[PDB]
Amino acid sequence: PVKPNYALKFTLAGHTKAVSSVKFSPNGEWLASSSADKLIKIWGAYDGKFEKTISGHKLGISDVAWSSDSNLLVSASDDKTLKIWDVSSGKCLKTLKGHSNYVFCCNFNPQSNLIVSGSFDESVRIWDVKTGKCLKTLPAHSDPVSAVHFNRDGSLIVSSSYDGLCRIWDTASGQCLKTLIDDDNPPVSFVKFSPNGKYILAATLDNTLKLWDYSKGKCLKTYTGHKNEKYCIFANFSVTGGKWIVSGSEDNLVYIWNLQTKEIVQKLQGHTDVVISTACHPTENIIASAALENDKTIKLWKSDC
Numbered sequence: 637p638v639k640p641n642y643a644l645k646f647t648l649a650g651h652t653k654a655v656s657s658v659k660f661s662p663n664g665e666w667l668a669s670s671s672a673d674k675l676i677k678i679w680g681a682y683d684g685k686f687e688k689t690i691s692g693h694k695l696g697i698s699d700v701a702w703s704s705d706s707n708l709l710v711s712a713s714d715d716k717t718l719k720i721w722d723v724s725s726g727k728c729l730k731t732l733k734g735h736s737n738y739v740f741c742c743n744f745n746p747q748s749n750l751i752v753s754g755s756f757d758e759s760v761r762i763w764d765v766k767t768g769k770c771l772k773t774l775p776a777h778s779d780p781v782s783a784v785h786f787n788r789d790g791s792l793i794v795s796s797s798y799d800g801l802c803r804i805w806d807t808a809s810g811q812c813l814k815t816l817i818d819d820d821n822p823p824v825s826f827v828k829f830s831p832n833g834k835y836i837l838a839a840t841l842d843n844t845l846k847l848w849d850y851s852k853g854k855c856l857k858t859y860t861g862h863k864n865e866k867y868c869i870f871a872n873f874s875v876t877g878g879k880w881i882v883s884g885s886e887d888n889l890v891y892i893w894n895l896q897t898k899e900i901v902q903k904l905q906g907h908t909d910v911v912i913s914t915a916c917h918p919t920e921n922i923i924a925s926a927a928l929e930n931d932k933t934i935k936l937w938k939s940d941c
């Protein structure tokens with residue numbers, strides 16, 4: 637494919653404050669959303685149909701993530717906890733306590749026996765899903781931690797921070813294996829491993845996204861044209877059709893780039909505030925996007941390629 641043709645299909649209204657994160661379930665059936673309104677909502681991934689609300693955090697929620705079997709969610713909240721939820725019942729199975737400030741970002745490992753979290757308290761924590769106990773506290777950064785992500789076999793964690801660093805961690809030992817810097821040390825506002833585990837995609841608050849070979853410390857691709865100077869905006873690899881990079885933007889648009897050529901191949905208009913979060917469906921060419929307080933809707937876009 638040369639360019640996609642994403643078109644708006646559904647708009648999901650229901651959160652009463654800004655939406656902070658949207659994520660598709662691994663089995664493709666569901667979209668989970670978190671919000672500053674302290675709620676998680678579940679929505680049908682293909683029809684946008686509202687399914688249920690999951691409640692329990694005492695303050696707003698920054699992030700949510702799915703277990704590999706699509707049965708559990710973990711949420712990261714300003715109440716300084718994470719919560720593990722059984723989605724079908726809505727029960728809170730565990731409350732993960734230990735961070736000393738807002739918990740901002742979270743993810744399961746592929747086995748989904750571990751959770752990783754990052755916090756305003758500048759640490760990264762690794763948690764046992766079964767017991768809810770904190771296994772390791774990493775002295776990861778010297779400013780708030782903007783993203784945490786496991787690689788494809790769970791052996792590595794990548795973290796990013798406003799301190800301008802990206803770090804790679806050994807899951808088993810907790811040791812810092814690599815520190816990665818970039819010219820003029822802009823805040824690193826998002827990072828995640830590529831699906832094959834060989835690269836990391838990193839956003840910095842100089843309106844720039846970069847694809848890095850972290851083993852060689854070499855920058856392979858640079859994507860620009862969007863606005864990102866303030867917020868920690870999710871970015872994605874889109875792999876179900878053409879190979880794209882997808883990101884939100886502070887000019888209220890979803891940006892889509894050709895991964896190899898770095899050209900902008902589509903901009904999606906419709907949101908009325910900053911697009912803080914995007915996600916890519918695991919098997920179909922479907923993008924979910926979510927916006928901040930003046931919009932607070934979620935949108936589902938569909939493409940033929």
Ligand SMILES: CCc1cc(C(=O)NC)c2nccc(N3CCc4c(cc(Cn5ccnc5)cc4-c4cn(C)nc4C(F)(F)F)C3=O)c2c1
Pocket residue numbers: 654655656657671672696697698699714740741756780781782783798866867868869870912913928929
């Ligand atoms: C590293 C932590 C940090 C540090 C600084 C800083 O230290 N600045 C000097 C900083 N500054 C300015 C703005 C910041 N924020 C704060 C708010 C926010 C932001 C990004 C995302 C999306 N997201 C979630 C995980 N990964 C990405 C969600 C929310 C959020 C959380 N809740 C409860 N409601 C919302 C919202 F916005 F939807 F309302 C975001 O960027 C910010 C964050």
